């Protein structure tokens with residue numbers, strides 16, 4: 001049997017329980033692994049080191065997103081390619097390489113070009129989960145994930161008091177970058193989901209994966225009630241000299257006098273978030289936000 005899968009580009013016929021799947025979407029690897037889906041190839045350098053697919057010698061390695069070996073996709077001859085986040089720019093190239101595969105694009109827009117990044121994130125993760133449940137005959141598991149996600153969102157919304165200000169940062173290489181409202185990496189769309197009041201707004205905000213450049217003193221002058229921290233380098237397997245984000249924040253002099261540090265109102269996203277921006281990661285993050293903000 002087959003199913004008609006609608007993505008941002010159109011609708012494509014996908015075999016149910018397809019063969020020789022290539023998966024390229026950081027947001028859905030953990031779902032596929034939890035469901036026991038066999039994969040033919042994945043881009044191992046962009047994935048969490050602990051992923052079972054990374055550790056499996058029988059899963060071929062497409063390589064990094066900067067320098068991929070897309071020819072392996074043709075050699076695998078897949079029935080399905082799952083494109084997402086870091087491989088979105090290769091969607092047209094992949095369709096040309098494997099014109100007989102169903103190629104689905106599960107990248108949704110959380111960039112500065114999105115007018116609704118919060119809804120794109122929430123509906124995008126739900127849509128990706130539902131589509132994969134249809135393709136892999138995991139509809140009950142997909143429904144449960146979506147229901148758990150909706151409930152986690154509701155609890156984290158209820159926990160936020162509506163007045164505390166929020167500073168969101170990406171720590172990389174010892175630097176504290178700004179994750180701007182709306183478009184900031186990981187945290188940006190969450191401002192829209194939860195209605196967080198920003199501690200700081202800057203000109204020229206972007207989606208820079210390292211955050212936008214801001215001085216520590218500018219962050220400190222905004223005196224946030226909360227600092228929410230993405231540890232970029234902790235998630236990346238090839239970054240072996242990494243300084244944990246907790247150490248960077250704890251020893252940043254200008255931040256010490258902020259209300260956030262003074263009250264211990266700092267939340268760190270899970271270690272693998274940067275390479276695993278998935279429902280499963282956000283169930284953990286939203287549970288921790290709900291506990292902290294209450």
Ligand SMILES: O=C(N[C@@H](CO)C(=O)O)c1cccc(O)c1O
Pocket residue numbers: 045046066086209236275
């Ligand atoms: O090496 C990475 N990026 C380099 C190119 O932007 C860098 O110099 O940081 C890198 C690795 C895994 C995953 C990433 O999103 C990533 O940006």
Ligand SMILES: O=C(N[C@@H](CO)C(=O)O)c1cccc(O)c1O
Pocket residue numbers: 065066085086209
């Ligand atoms: O395309 C990506 N990175 C390249 C362009 O900025 C790069 O040069 O690393 C890319 C896409 C989504 C998410 C990322 O962290 C990422 O590094």
Ligand SMILES: [Cl-]
Pocket residue numbers: 011012013
């Ligand atoms: Cl089709």
Ligand SMILES: [Cl-]
Pocket residue numbers: 180181200201202203205
């Ligand atoms: Cl901003």
Ligand SMILES: [Fe+3]
Pocket residue numbers: 209
């Ligand atoms: Fe990146």
